[PDB]
Design a protein around this ligand. Sequence first.
Ligand SMILES: [Zn+2]
Length: 536
Amino acid sequence: DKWEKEFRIRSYEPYSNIAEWADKLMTKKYSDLDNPTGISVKAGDDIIVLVGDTYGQNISMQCIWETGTEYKQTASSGDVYMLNPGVNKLTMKGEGQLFVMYNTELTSNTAKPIKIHIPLGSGTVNGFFDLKEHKTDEKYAELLKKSTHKYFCIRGEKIMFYFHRNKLLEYVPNNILSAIHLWDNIVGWQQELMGIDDVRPSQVNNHLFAISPEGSYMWASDYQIGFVYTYLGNILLEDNVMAAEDNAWGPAHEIGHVHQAAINWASSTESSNNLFSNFIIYKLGKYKSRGNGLGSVATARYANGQAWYNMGDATHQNEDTETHMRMNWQLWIYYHRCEYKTDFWQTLFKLMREVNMTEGEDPGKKQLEFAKMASKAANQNLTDFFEMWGFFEPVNTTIEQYGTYKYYVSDAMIREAKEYMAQFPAPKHAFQYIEDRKKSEFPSNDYRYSAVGDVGYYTQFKENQKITKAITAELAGRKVSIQNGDEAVAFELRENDENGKLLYFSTFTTFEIPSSILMVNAKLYAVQADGKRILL
Ligand SMILES: [Zn+2]
């Protein structure tokens, strides 16, 4: 049959080396299971493999099956059989599906497809579905029907699925294109921010590989990402992925953990990956962004005297991810959504890969390398943004987040960072006050309704709105009421004058000043989008 031949006789394309690129790109390891054969085996099977010209390349065959004591899951490795040009005869130490391991430097003129024939009689043809080669749902459906193994492999452009046959048949017996295009796009959108088009796919072309463990929930790790087999209806059906906000968030967040290291430092590990989560949500086009309002920052910084590392986490027991995740996102909203620098994040990723600091080696140092590199990437002095976000508080402590780390930010380190950042021109806007949400977008029962404030929506920045009205303020007790201030982007309490230190801020047009704020010498300013402060 032509079905057997399609899998028994194939050309296997070269893929890059995963360890090399995980180091270079500062990611968790991608998969090296890029090359299914679609042949399953049983323990003791004899397998003839005829191999063509290998062009000097060392290649091998790996048999992939299951691991785990508590419950079973597809393993990231298995029995490996060396291959040579010509005739090979393998005896399978165990059962599984075969993968050709052809990993090499892609730019070499020896990195050509290798032809490999596993003739009738050796193992069983299961098949797999290639997006580029097979193209149609009708062919997917046909291949899935003819398959027999526990697991069936679907190879997209950027992600693969290696899921339980019975689950695919249960949710997607006749169609895969919608599913595989969606998940390729989710991966591709994360890669888009990382600014790696110079090297992907020319030098790096490995896939992410999604397995369906028989336990846990969802996660991403070196080699594989996992979604429990009971959860696949919420992966394989786009309508289900889109049915609630969380259904794209969770998986996008887990994939983000693969990609976050360049920009991440301990204290930030469960928020920095939400740059990716929020970008996925944005690209999917249905739901508004996630995170607290800027009020949470004001409270942490100015009411409670917190820095970045302990923002919203006084007792030092859990990162405040809902507050922290707004920081990277505000940089995306301003530079990307407002189009002030549409390659800002790609530039910043590149610079952080140059900085090349692990997440834990020196988080206080890394926090300041991030502020410096953000300034360099924007070609703007982001002192005020990083000040609001707590980056210029001195710190001398330890933290715990997937390990204990010494957190040390010295006055000198602070001084050096500000000096470095002062080489760039003043920012064009006070976008530390930016939002991509407004109150009218949410029902009153949604956390964002009461959190997002009144002013500072991104259009005020993109259109460079000016304050033209007769803006006034009244103080009654600790209550500030602003009149005619809807054109401003925020309201600030500052010491002595507009160049004095910030005491408090709000993006609400009515707000209570905390008891802890020191009000002697304090003046109230409306902030214009471009940074002008107007005494009220
Ligand atoms: Zn996480």
